[PDB]
Amino acid sequence: GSSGSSGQERLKITALPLYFEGFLLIKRSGYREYEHYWTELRGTTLFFYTDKKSIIYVDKLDIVDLTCLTEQNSTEKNCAKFTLVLPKEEVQLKTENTESGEEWRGFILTVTELSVPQNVSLLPGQVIKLHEVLEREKKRRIESGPSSG
């Protein structure tokens, strides 16, 4: 119907540093049909949302222990389709166009390999992100290990 409120909610720092954003399609055994959700790339955890307004992500994933990334030819549409190989379970991912794909894929490979893929098609203005995003997660490396047990 409608909502009402008096105040501005514009924070800069929340929990994890933002790297990328765009409507991503999630697919996992059972889904059957790629799900739509405002996916957000942060640190090394994929956060799925429903709307920018939403503060609490409807659901989130994890690709920190990513084992690798596969590609699916899929002769039909020229898009980027890869599967997130995890040491626990695999998950399907999809974008809107090849562009976004290369973006995520790259961005991910960056927030997974702890480096930057030089085998992409992105530009010098996009690659930077990969570099930045990297250095961004790099710091994380600082306090990551298990502090005592």
PDB file of all heavy atoms in Angstrom, residues 48-60:
ATOM      1  N   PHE A  48      22.061 -11.271  -0.603  1.00  0.00           N
ATOM      2  CA  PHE A  48      20.908 -11.125  -1.476  1.00  0.00           C
ATOM      3  C   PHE A  48      19.806 -10.311  -0.796  1.00  0.00           C
ATOM      4  O   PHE A  48      19.429 -10.596   0.340  1.00  0.00           O
ATOM      5  CB  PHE A  48      20.382 -12.535  -1.761  1.00  0.00           C
ATOM      6  CG  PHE A  48      21.467 -13.531  -2.171  1.00  0.00           C
ATOM      7  CD1 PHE A  48      21.430 -14.808  -1.703  1.00  0.00           C
ATOM      8  CD2 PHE A  48      22.468 -13.142  -3.005  1.00  0.00           C
ATOM      9  CE1 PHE A  48      22.437 -15.734  -2.083  1.00  0.00           C
ATOM     10  CE2 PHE A  48      23.476 -14.068  -3.385  1.00  0.00           C
ATOM     11  CZ  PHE A  48      23.438 -15.344  -2.917  1.00  0.00           C
ATOM     12  N   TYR A  49      19.318  -9.314  -1.520  1.00  0.00           N
ATOM     13  CA  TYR A  49      18.267  -8.457  -1.000  1.00  0.00           C
ATOM     14  C   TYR A  49      17.053  -8.451  -1.932  1.00  0.00           C
ATOM     15  O   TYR A  49      17.077  -9.076  -2.991  1.00  0.00           O
ATOM     16  CB  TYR A  49      18.860  -7.047  -0.948  1.00  0.00           C
ATOM     17  CG  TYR A  49      19.848  -6.830   0.200  1.00  0.00           C
ATOM     18  CD1 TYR A  49      21.203  -6.973  -0.019  1.00  0.00           C
ATOM     19  CD2 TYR A  49      19.384  -6.491   1.455  1.00  0.00           C
ATOM     20  CE1 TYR A  49      22.132  -6.769   1.061  1.00  0.00           C
ATOM     21  CE2 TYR A  49      20.313  -6.287   2.535  1.00  0.00           C
ATOM     22  CZ  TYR A  49      21.642  -6.435   2.285  1.00  0.00           C
ATOM     23  OH  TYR A  49      22.520  -6.243   3.306  1.00  0.00           O
ATOM     24  N   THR A  50      16.021  -7.740  -1.503  1.00  0.00           N
ATOM     25  CA  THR A  50      14.801  -7.645  -2.286  1.00  0.00           C
ATOM     26  C   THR A  50      14.633  -6.232  -2.844  1.00  0.00           C
ATOM     27  O   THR A  50      14.052  -6.046  -3.913  1.00  0.00           O
ATOM     28  CB  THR A  50      13.635  -8.091  -1.400  1.00  0.00           C
ATOM     29  OG1 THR A  50      13.511  -7.046  -0.438  1.00  0.00           O
ATOM     30  CG2 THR A  50      13.974  -9.327  -0.565  1.00  0.00           C
ATOM     31  N   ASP A  51      15.152  -5.269  -2.097  1.00  0.00           N
ATOM     32  CA  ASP A  51      15.068  -3.877  -2.503  1.00  0.00           C
ATOM     33  C   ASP A  51      16.116  -3.062  -1.743  1.00  0.00           C
ATOM     34  O   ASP A  51      16.545  -3.455  -0.659  1.00  0.00           O
ATOM     35  CB  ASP A  51      13.690  -3.291  -2.182  1.00  0.00           C
ATOM     36  CG  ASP A  51      12.514  -3.999  -2.857  1.00  0.00           C
ATOM     37  OD1 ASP A  51      12.550  -4.098  -4.103  1.00  0.00           O
ATOM     38  OD2 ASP A  51      11.605  -4.424  -2.112  1.00  0.00           O
ATOM     39  N   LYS A  52      16.499  -1.943  -2.342  1.00  0.00           N
ATOM     40  CA  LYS A  52      17.489  -1.072  -1.734  1.00  0.00           C
ATOM     41  C   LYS A  52      16.999  -0.635  -0.352  1.00  0.00           C
ATOM     42  O   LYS A  52      17.799  -0.464   0.568  1.00  0.00           O
ATOM     43  CB  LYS A  52      17.819   0.096  -2.667  1.00  0.00           C
ATOM     44  CG  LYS A  52      16.607   1.014  -2.845  1.00  0.00           C
ATOM     45  CD  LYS A  52      16.380   1.340  -4.323  1.00  0.00           C
ATOM     46  CE  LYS A  52      16.602   2.829  -4.596  1.00  0.00           C
ATOM     47  NZ  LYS A  52      16.976   3.045  -6.012  1.00  0.00           N
ATOM     48  N   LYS A  53      15.690  -0.468  -0.249  1.00  0.00           N
ATOM     49  CA  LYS A  53      15.084  -0.055   1.005  1.00  0.00           C
ATOM     50  C   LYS A  53      15.407  -1.089   2.086  1.00  0.00           C
ATOM     51  O   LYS A  53      15.824  -0.731   3.187  1.00  0.00           O
ATOM     52  CB  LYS A  53      13.585   0.193   0.821  1.00  0.00           C
ATOM     53  CG  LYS A  53      13.338   1.452  -0.012  1.00  0.00           C
ATOM     54  CD  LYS A  53      12.823   1.094  -1.407  1.00  0.00           C
ATOM     55  CE  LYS A  53      13.247   2.146  -2.435  1.00  0.00           C
ATOM     56  NZ  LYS A  53      12.706   1.812  -3.771  1.00  0.00           N
ATOM     57  N   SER A  54      15.201  -2.350   1.736  1.00  0.00           N
ATOM     58  CA  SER A  54      15.465  -3.437   2.664  1.00  0.00           C
ATOM     59  C   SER A  54      16.862  -3.282   3.268  1.00  0.00           C
ATOM     60  O   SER A  54      17.829  -3.031   2.550  1.00  0.00           O
ATOM     61  CB  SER A  54      15.334  -4.795   1.971  1.00  0.00           C
ATOM     62  OG  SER A  54      13.988  -5.261   1.960  1.00  0.00           O
ATOM     63  N   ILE A  55      16.924  -3.437   4.582  1.00  0.00           N
ATOM     64  CA  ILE A  55      18.186  -3.317   5.291  1.00  0.00           C
ATOM     65  C   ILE A  55      18.745  -4.714   5.568  1.00  0.00           C
ATOM     66  O   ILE A  55      19.952  -4.932   5.478  1.00  0.00           O
ATOM     67  CB  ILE A  55      18.016  -2.463   6.548  1.00  0.00           C
ATOM     68  CG1 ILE A  55      17.061  -1.295   6.293  1.00  0.00           C
ATOM     69  CG2 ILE A  55      19.371  -1.990   7.079  1.00  0.00           C
ATOM     70  CD1 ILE A  55      15.680  -1.575   6.890  1.00  0.00           C
ATOM     71  N   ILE A  56      17.841  -5.623   5.900  1.00  0.00           N
ATOM     72  CA  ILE A  56      18.229  -6.993   6.191  1.00  0.00           C
ATOM     73  C   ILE A  56      18.055  -7.846   4.933  1.00  0.00           C
ATOM     74  O   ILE A  56      16.936  -8.039   4.459  1.00  0.00           O
ATOM     75  CB  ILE A  56      17.460  -7.522   7.404  1.00  0.00           C
ATOM     76  CG1 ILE A  56      17.643  -6.603   8.612  1.00  0.00           C
ATOM     77  CG2 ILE A  56      17.854  -8.967   7.716  1.00  0.00           C
ATOM     78  CD1 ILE A  56      18.979  -6.873   9.308  1.00  0.00           C
ATOM     79  N   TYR A  57      19.178  -8.334   4.427  1.00  0.00           N
ATOM     80  CA  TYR A  57      19.164  -9.161   3.233  1.00  0.00           C
ATOM     81  C   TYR A  57      18.280 -10.394   3.430  1.00  0.00           C
ATOM     82  O   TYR A  57      18.429 -11.117   4.414  1.00  0.00           O
ATOM     83  CB  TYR A  57      20.609  -9.614   3.016  1.00  0.00           C
ATOM     84  CG  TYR A  57      21.213 -10.357   4.209  1.00  0.00           C
ATOM     85  CD1 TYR A  57      20.988 -11.710   4.365  1.00  0.00           C
ATOM     86  CD2 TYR A  57      21.984  -9.675   5.129  1.00  0.00           C
ATOM     87  CE1 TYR A  57      21.558 -12.410   5.487  1.00  0.00           C
ATOM     88  CE2 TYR A  57      22.553 -10.375   6.252  1.00  0.00           C
ATOM     89  CZ  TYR A  57      22.311 -11.707   6.375  1.00  0.00           C
ATOM     90  OH  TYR A  57      22.848 -12.368   7.436  1.00  0.00           O
ATOM     91  N   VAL A  58      17.380 -10.596   2.479  1.00  0.00           N
ATOM     92  CA  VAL A  58      16.472 -11.728   2.537  1.00  0.00           C
ATOM     93  C   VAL A  58      17.275 -13.009   2.776  1.00  0.00           C
ATOM     94  O   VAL A  58      16.808 -13.922   3.454  1.00  0.00           O
ATOM     95  CB  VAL A  58      15.624 -11.784   1.264  1.00  0.00           C
ATOM     96  CG1 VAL A  58      16.498 -12.022   0.032  1.00  0.00           C
ATOM     97  CG2 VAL A  58      14.535 -12.853   1.378  1.00  0.00           C
ATOM     98  N   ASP A  59      18.471 -13.035   2.204  1.00  0.00           N
ATOM     99  CA  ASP A  59      19.344 -14.188   2.346  1.00  0.00           C
ATOM    100  C   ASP A  59      20.748 -13.822   1.863  1.00  0.00           C
ATOM    101  O   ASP A  59      20.916 -12.884   1.085  1.00  0.00           O
ATOM    102  CB  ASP A  59      18.845 -15.363   1.504  1.00  0.00           C
ATOM    103  CG  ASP A  59      18.487 -16.622   2.296  1.00  0.00           C
ATOM    104  OD1 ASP A  59      18.478 -16.524   3.543  1.00  0.00           O
ATOM    105  OD2 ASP A  59      18.230 -17.653   1.639  1.00  0.00           O
ATOM    106  N   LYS A  60      21.722 -14.581   2.345  1.00  0.00           N
ATOM    107  CA  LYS A  60      23.106 -14.348   1.971  1.00  0.00           C
ATOM    108  C   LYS A  60      23.784 -15.688   1.678  1.00  0.00           C
ATOM    109  O   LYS A  60      23.312 -16.735   2.120  1.00  0.00           O
ATOM    110  CB  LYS A  60      23.819 -13.520   3.043  1.00  0.00           C
ATOM    111  CG  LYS A  60      23.962 -14.315   4.343  1.00  0.00           C
ATOM    112  CD  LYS A  60      24.971 -13.650   5.283  1.00  0.00           C
ATOM    113  CE  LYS A  60      25.336 -14.581   6.441  1.00  0.00           C
ATOM    114  NZ  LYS A  60      25.011 -13.945   7.738  1.00  0.00           N
TER     115      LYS A  60
END
